Amino acid sequence: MYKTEKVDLALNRNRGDPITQHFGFGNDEWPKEWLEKLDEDGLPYIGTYVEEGDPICA
DNA sequence: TTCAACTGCTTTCGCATCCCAACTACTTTTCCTCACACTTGTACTCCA
Numbered sequence: 001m002y003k004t005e006k007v008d009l010a011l012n013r014n015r016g017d018p019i020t021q022h023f024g025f026g027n028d029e030w031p032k033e034w035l036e037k038l039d040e041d042g043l044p045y046i047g048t049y050v051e052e053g054d055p056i057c058a
Numbered sequence: 059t060t061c062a063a064c065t066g067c068t069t070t071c072g073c074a075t076c077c078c079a080a081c082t083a084c085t086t087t088t089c090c091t092c093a094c095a096c097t098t099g100t101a102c103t104c105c106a
Contacts, residue, residue, distance in 0.1 A: 016077060
């Protein structure tokens, strides 16, 4: 069974409101172990086993 | 002694006007490159 989820970051933002949040990581403000599931661009490696709780993008 | 509006009730889980942008314009930011009018002698004879 296949399922698609639309991760969207313009869902809350007004058309006039400028850009607030950015895919990726922010430096010097760091939780580790997100890097087992996720990649440098904040997107998951494809082929990765996830469960409920696991991070799906940063 | 009756007509006519105001009346709560059908199930049982879970499903499911303001802003932005376009292209073409015109403009400013300045820094770099020279000319244009003025003047004393000297030169060629000038009139004595």
